[model samples]
Target: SMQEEDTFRELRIFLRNVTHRLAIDKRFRVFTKPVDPDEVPDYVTVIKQPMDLSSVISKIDLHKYLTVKDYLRDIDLICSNALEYNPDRDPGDRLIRHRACALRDTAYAIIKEELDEDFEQLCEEIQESR
Candidate 1:
């Protein structure tokens, strides 16, 4: 749908700005060392590997939340934001990565849920799609 496309486009722009801000504010460093092109994994390759999001999820104290609904709401928001961003220059790869990240983020949010199966499947599917 055109509307969905527009929404994604806007989200991509917003995420780009946010990424830039985070890079500047956090004083993030990028390796300047030269490496062979073969050394760098393609976007699909990276997405195929399941992310260990335990550190990020651990930072959140879900116990403080009033209810499961509230926690899920927060999780949804995080998933949405994560899915909106695409770091890859290729639009197709960007979308694939975004979806993969979103799935991972969503699983992380629902810490109590048994997501190992789903997570692994999604990661494999993402890699295969690419």
Candidate 2:
């Protein structure tokens, strides 16, 4: 079992990788948050920017707050609720919780996906700078 801190670290790395892939490969250049050369954050500004443990890890709390935050608590409840039904020792069950796992998957599919509009727009902005 991974510690709580490990979750945050992993999520931050996930976001960094998404940004890095777009940063190094330009299409429409709309991938940058501000959509401008000057407005970019230090994290994805350079193609080969150093991770600099102090700079990257220090912001884990802030990024974690933005990305995951209370989602973990919600997830815990969802999982714990599952344990109660494994045996289903009662004849009077109110809710069918088995479908919840599928809904939780929506958090990633619905939230993480970039819309079709964003692809062409992003491509139009970044013209293979790499």
Candidate 3:
């Protein structure tokens, strides 16, 4: 029987698998933990809802993501937060921002290569069932 909870469960599994794939990328290390407020006090002020890989992983384990879109949203937040704080305009220190850009690129590549096809098909199936 097609049910909403079952749909969410399957999506959560997909998110978990994607996270596992992302974990192998070294660029992701910078985003694995929450930014330390003491180290970057302005971060909390700028990013209202800071996100990181460890927190995302925790949320996935907690079944907090209802769909792949939700998972991707958080991933975007992680990168965007870095981009905001590290401002590319600061030519003296573009390293952090560059890392964020790399992580975003890598994440998308892995998702497109390994999951996008199945996700599209699964989404269509869900819609048809609805």
Predicted structure with the largest TM-score when compared to the true one: 3
List runs of model 1 lying over 4 Å from the truth.
1-62, 87-130
Question: For residues 1-130, what per-residue lDDT tens digits would candidate 2 score against the true structure?
Answer: 2443454455556545533443344331222222234653542433232222123234443653224423333333343444343336453232323333433443334335732434334333332321
Clashing pairs in 3: none
> Sorted by TM-score, highest first, which candidate order results?
3, 2, 1
In candidate 2, list every pair of residues with a backbone clash: 27-123, 27-126, 28-122, 28-123, 28-124, 28-125, 28-126, 29-125, 29-126
Comparison by TM-score, 1 against 3, better one: 3
Higher-scoring candidate on lDDT, 1 or 3: 3
Give me the overall lDDT of model 2.
0.37
TM-score of 3: 0.77
Candidate 1 lDDT, tens digit per residue, 1-130? 5654453344334333333332343211121112234754453353332222231233222222222333345435434433443455798656545554444353344443532445334434533454
By lDDT, the best candidate is 3
TM-score of 1: 0.27
Structural RMSD, model 3:
3.1
